[PDB]
């Protein structure tokens, strides 16, 4: 009945101007019992309320910002826009819309979660295969590494050999230093896949284009 | 377990300390005369500050504040009665009569652009009808009231106007919330017609809801339970009312509607009848018939027992008159032409409008003495200073002392500033205000049976 | 604003057991004349958006069955679950929306009781394609260990260096049950040729000994 | 209470045996406004046509006829004191009996009593019932009254 | 099937019932105005203040009248005042008043 | 007193869907005070009584 | 709900009420 999806620019620069848009289906914002919010989180902190708008065009913001945080709805193509001005680095998060009611007083059904994350330019990934140590004849478990440092924006896929021997998969998330990001990737087998079988690094990074294969 | 909480000095009423003699007095005003425009002033154009034709209409309070020579300055053929070292002399009232001699006839306003959508009385058919600009000439009968008050201080009135909002909110609605505020009552200003006791200066952005002489205004009310609930009650001697209207016409706003009525009280219908028009509706009050045996003037008043406590007893030696009429309100229209010729045309006069007024004050008084003494001027005192200082007797050292020191400086205001208050006693509160005056100074007269009153006053006093 | 505060921030919990998750606030959620208390709930699923629970601290969701119930009144306030099952593995969170403006609680994870288990160990040098750009990243895997609460070192010649020292974990594994991590000790390459030895270790809760392994910089 | 009270003086009564309770004597029921009526209607209610003078008529077809009108309502002034809150009452929907071939579906009306509480209204002159439950069009009376049910005093019960 | 709407009349001011006092000295029932449990319960219904307020503000202003530009509000006001009068009873409770009062509460 | 059926359930309104009723209702009270009284019987009296009924 | 919990005075001549209750009490 309801349904709910947002769209927003994505990639922004610092100082600049976000126009987050926010789209529904199933009802009509100017009845009276629809009321609507905007709710960011980052990827490791906790969630907080910026702002909340409502049937007789009236706006409450999150009073610590107070300034560049401007809530506008359109009812007439039953969406609501999200304005903010000058985005600084603290920004860097996962903004949710959804509907809100008052006889649960909270949020009943988000949706999609677009993601925008701010820095200055995006750079290209440098893909870097892990090899193993020379070393003494271990054969404990030869695990492998392919290590992907130094990209910008998100996100990145990162796939291993199609239909081979599978036995798991070790997917980490990004590291937050200077903008460009950081992130890397494990596959742990018994020491049987290597070097006999073959593994290789399939990198998408589908802002830039470009793709390289490589073997250890 | 419990107690008796806290004593507390109470008021007592007047005629504790109060004496009266048998010396009676009489006063009388002339005939007083206003004449004016029933809508509007009529200011200078050049200078913007004088007035060339003042605004008086029926529905104006006529406040009056009469004043009394001091009796302490008197010279007595027989000063034996009392003694001016140990006592003082003051007035008090008794008598009221007020007379008002234009033939009866209500007066009518109205107001050219005023915001009728339709009549909603047996025909209002769908759809809505075209326009953006839908205002009309309608002319509008008042209704009808009658009052009157006396009192030492003057009148208090309220009313509503725009007050403080609330804080930052995003579910209280964009509409001017409604506050309640004490005014003091003054001259020109008006009263209500069933329209709320709201100023319409600043609550209706439109000016096209109430006829012309009430848009910029404040539509005052006298109140009942506050003035009666003054302690003191220096306020209220004595007082009636009279009022009536009905309902003659109904009519609705025009605009967007502020509000949308909800759905779950209506089913909606559809063809021509998709869109909705207004709920804003309004009555008009017209007014009735008006006898010559409603009224409330040219009759005496005796007073034996006010319902404050104070007996009639008027310090500061100042009354507060005040009546309202709209009985005697009806309006002259005057035609003067431009030239002279044998066949009608409608440029060769011009019109004004004008509305005439009168009044009549007539009392009689009587006087009483104060027998001072050391346990009566401490209770003066603490309900007023002004009375203790004007009779010229004494002045007061406001404490005992203080009992902090207060640290007072002494070389003047050259390190740490500090609010240095040039003060002023302004030698009244009133003087910011404005009433039609009327001196009595030279109008007292001791022998009775030469004027109305007295040779009605002789029969109900049985001497 | 009025803060929020939760406890504690996960908490391991078998199938079948009772859950008793704590929010606290700094001023009291009830009000003169509504007397209902302003406290919500939500339900975070790894890969899913929150979803309401239960409103005004007593009164549920339409959907949310009757295990899940709310407590608390005044200051003090607990979720109380009656049996957990397999599909309510989330992220909570605490919602006062009594006073403007509204803001959200430190949030609990809950997960599913299984072994304890010490992660296995591995080291790697940093990649000398790395080394011709002129960066050393020494990257140390520790995987397939549970719980989460695990202190990590690193040792040049033995002597402990925090600076460099960035560590990300992953989810939970879907069979196996346990977590994982990485820790790149980032730095430099002109600091890489003066020392020899490379250490990470580790200390977590099942093994307070340390796990190492290690690798001297100039042998092959 | 009477009881717990700060007398002046307690040596009149004997506390050991007996009681003090209040009792009412004197009464004022003040009130501070203006004296002017008001006005409600219904956008959409429910009339035909005019039939006080001239309904020179063929028939007349038409989906929906409503229209926007609204009037005022009778001057009413009571008051009254009790020890227990008041009872009125009001006509209602109930049991129909479901019996011989009742073929014309008019509801049987049946005497309700219950407590007055603030925000219901008196009569308007339209019948002392339940609007909302009784009506179905919504659009016989003036928006104030339609969802609610009104009441009235019961003085011989 | 017809239906009459009503139409009030003159409202004076001297036939109203409120602002002047009453004194109880015999009722009709038979508690002269004792108050058990230590409550009262006053009721009082009138529809002769009953007007009400034309609110309308702007959204913009113009040198042209434009009926977009004003939203028109209503409200509506009232005021009451309470005031009482009382006096103190005492009961001589003795042995069968205790089965007279507790059937009655 | 006037009342309203309806036969369907519709999101508008339409003419043909209601069904009226018109009604009024009436109530009373009667409370009556009596006083006893005897008649002496006399002849005369019962020639009074039996000729008026 | 009105509350006169603690709005009690046995001073009668301060209100308008019982100052004509007194000229009423013949007292």
Redo the contacts between chains.
């Keep these: 009945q309801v349904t709910l999806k947002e769209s927003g620019p994505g990639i922004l620069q610092p100082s600049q101007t976000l126009s987050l848009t926010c789209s529904f289906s199933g009802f009509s914002l100017?009845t009276?019992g629809m009321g609507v919010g905007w709710i960011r989180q980052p990827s490791g902190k906790?969630?907080?309320?910026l702002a909340?708008?409502?049937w007789?065009?009236?706006?409450?913001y999150?009073?610590a910002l107070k300034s560049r945080l401007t809530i506008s709805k359109d009812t007439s193509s039953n969406r609501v826009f999200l304005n903010i001005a000058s985005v600084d680095t603290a920004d860097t998060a996962t903004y949710?819309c959804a509907r809100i009611?008052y006889?649960?007083?909270?949020?009943?059904?988000?949706?999609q979660?677009t993601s925008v994350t701010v820095s200055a330019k995006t750079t290209a990934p440098?893909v870097?295969?892990?090899?193993?140590?020379?070393?003494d004849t271990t054969g404990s478990?030869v695990?492998l590494?392919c290590?992907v440092?130094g990209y910008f924006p998100e996100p990145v896929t990162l796939t291993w050999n199609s239909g081979s021997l599978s036995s798991?998969v070790?997917?980490?998330?990004?590291?937050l230093?200077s903008d460009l990001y950081?992130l890397?990737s494990?596959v742990?087998v018994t020491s049987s896949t290597w070097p006999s079988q073959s593994i290789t690094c399939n990198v998408a990074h589908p802002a830039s284009s470009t793709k390289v294969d490589k073997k250890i | 377990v419990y107690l008796p909480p806290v004593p507390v000095s109470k008021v007592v009423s007047t005629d504790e300390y109060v004496s009266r003699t048998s010396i009676y007095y009489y006063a009388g005003s002339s005939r007083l005369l206003a004449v004016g425009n029933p809508y509007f002033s009529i200011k200078s154009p050049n200078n913007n500050k004088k007035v060339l034709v003042p605004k008086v209409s029926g529905l104006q309070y006529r406040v009056f504040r009469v004043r009394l020579p001091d009796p302490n300055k008197f010279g007595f053929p027989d000063t034996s009665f009392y003694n001016p070292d140990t006592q003082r002399l003051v007035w008090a009232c008794v008598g009221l009569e007020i007379g008002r001699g234009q033939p009866l006839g209500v007066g009518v306003s109205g107001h050219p652009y005023l915001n009728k959508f339709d009549d909603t009385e047996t025909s209002n058919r769908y759809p809505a009808q075209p326009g953006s600009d839908n205002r009309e000439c309608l002319s509008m009968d008042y209704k009808q009231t009658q009052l009157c008050l006396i009192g030492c201080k003057p009148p208090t009135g309220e009313h509503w106007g725009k007050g403080v909002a609330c804080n930052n909110n995003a579910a209280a609605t964009d509409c001017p919330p409604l506050e309640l505020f004490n005014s003091i009552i003054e001259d020109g200003d008006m009263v209500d017609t069933g329209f709320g006791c709201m100023d319409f200066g600043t609550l209706q952005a439109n000016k096209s809801d109430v006829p012309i002489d009430i848009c910029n205004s404040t539509c005052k009310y006298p109140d009942y339970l506050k003035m009666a609930s003054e302690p003191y009650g220096d306020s209220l001697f004595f007082f009636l009312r009279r009022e009536q209207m009905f309902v003659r016409h109904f009519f609705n706003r025009a605009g967007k509607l502020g509000e949308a009525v909800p759905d779950d009280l209506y089913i909606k219908g559809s063809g021509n009848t998709a869109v909705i028009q207004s709920s804003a509706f309004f009555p008009t009050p017209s007014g009735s018939i008006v006898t010559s045996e409603s009224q409330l003037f040219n009759k005496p008043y005796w007073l034996q027992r006010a319902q404050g406590h104070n007996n009639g007893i008027c310090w500061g030696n100042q009354l507060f008159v005040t009546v309202v009429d709209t009985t005697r309100s009806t309006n002259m229209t005057l035609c003067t032409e431009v030239t002279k010729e044998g066949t009608y045309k409608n440029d060769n006069f011009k019109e004004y409008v004008r509305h005439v007024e009168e009044y009549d004050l007539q009392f009689v008084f009587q006087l009483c003495k104060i027998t001072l003494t050391a346990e009566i001027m401490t209770y003066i005192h603490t309900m007023d200073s002004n009375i203790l200082e004007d009779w010229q007797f004494g002045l007061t050292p406001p404490p005992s002392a203080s009992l902090q020191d207060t640290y007072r400086f002494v070389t003047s205001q050259a390190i740490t500033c500090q609010k240095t208050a040039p003060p002023k006693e302004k030698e009244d509160p009133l003087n910011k205000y404005t009433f039609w005056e009327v001196n009595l100074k030279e109008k007292f007269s001791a022998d009775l049976d030469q004027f109305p009153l007295g040779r009605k006053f002789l029969l109900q006093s049985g001497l | 604003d009025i803060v929020m505060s939760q406890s504690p921030s996960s908490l391991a919990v078998s199938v079948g057991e009772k859950v008793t998750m704590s929010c606290k606030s700094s001023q009291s959620l009830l009000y003169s004349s509504i007397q209902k208390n302003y406290l919500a709930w939500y339900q975070q699923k790894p890969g899913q958006s929150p979803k309401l629970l239960i409103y005004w601290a007593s009164i549920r969701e339409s959907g949310v069955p009757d295990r899940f119930t709310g407590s608390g009144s005044g200051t003090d306030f607990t979720l109380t679950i009656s049996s957990v099952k397999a599909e309510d593995l989330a992220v909570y969170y605490c919602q006062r929306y009594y006073g403007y403006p509204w803001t959200f609680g430190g949030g609990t994870k809950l997960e599913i009781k299984r072994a304890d288990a010490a992660p296995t160990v591995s080291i790697f040098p940093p990649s000398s394609e790395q080394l011709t750009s002129g960066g050393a990243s020494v990257v140390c895997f520790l995987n397939n260990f549970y719980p989460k609460d695990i202190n990590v070192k690193w040792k040049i010649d033995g002597s402990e260096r925090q600076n460099g020292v960035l560590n990300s974990w992953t989810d939970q594994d879907s069979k196996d049950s346990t977590y994982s991590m990485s820790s790149t000790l980032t730095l430099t390459k002109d600091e890489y040729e003066r020392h020899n030895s490379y250490t990470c270790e580790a200390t977590h809760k099942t093994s307070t000994s340390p796990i190492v392994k290690s690798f001297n910089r100039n042998e092959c």
Excluded at chain 1, 128 to 135: D, F, I, K, Q, S
Excluded at chain 1, 170 to 175: E, G, L, S
């Design positions: 100017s009276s906790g969630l907080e309320w909340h708008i409502w007789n065009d009236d706006k409450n999150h009073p949710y009611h006889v649960t007083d909270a949020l009943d059904y988000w949706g979660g440098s870097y295969p892990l090899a193993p140590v020379c070393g478990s695990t590494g290590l440092k798991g070790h997917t980490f998330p990004a590291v230093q950081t890397s494990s742990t």
